Design a protein around this ligand. Sequence first.
Ligand code: CL
Length: 293
Amino acid sequence: EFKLQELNLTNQDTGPYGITVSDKGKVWITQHKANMISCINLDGKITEYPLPTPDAKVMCLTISSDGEVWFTENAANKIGRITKKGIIKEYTLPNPDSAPYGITEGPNGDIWFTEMNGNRIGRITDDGKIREYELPNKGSYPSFITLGSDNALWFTENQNNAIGRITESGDITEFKIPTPASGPVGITKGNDDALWFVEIIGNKIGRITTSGEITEFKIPTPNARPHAITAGAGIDLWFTEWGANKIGRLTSNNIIEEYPIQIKSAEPHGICFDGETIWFAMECDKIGKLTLI
Ligand SMILES: [Cl-]
């Protein structure tokens, strides 16, 4: 069993999507229809940051170690940044229609991101300089990206049916997933030091060690359409089932439990865990807060 609370956001049908939480306790969400980033503090103050570029399709975000928020503008071909001063800088990608998507901090503190349509991994510095690494197979659709325990970046190749690894020097290794045409999407680092990902078509959670060894676990609800995944406490992983309106949990003897979301077309997207609470973005201008026990 489990407890759920909600946070209302609603300037209208804003398309809440990506979510993260500061160690300050602040939650940040992107809102792709409203074209904005919102943060809510624990005392409930909300700040909405309209993007300078209209119809930018803001997708994913991350908080860097120095506290700034970085994000991808999927339709506007840009990486954005909200500085500590609350000012937004954007940086335009060198090739057009790159469709940046996933975003994460790397081992030396640069910001790394996938280009879905550009078929590249990007890298940007403090000072806005961009470096990019072309993927070997065309039409790979690199999607989510995370830092692995090996201090390499790991990402899903949604249409090449593989997990890629890229080191700080740009060396790429692709591990083919054993479930054909499985559609990997979310990936994250587990506390077991492997990477864990979701297969949207496969209806599986996957695990890949930093040496490339892949195991899979069948999600009980058919057509669950999992999307994002995050580590929990211990060896727990938590994931969103957009298709089934549930929150999934991999706990433990690699059992998958599911917790149905009491509400309507929640269509959960992003997910984050803060040591006690599972936070997730929901389509209907809300954020969910889930807790066990
Ligand atoms: Cl780095």
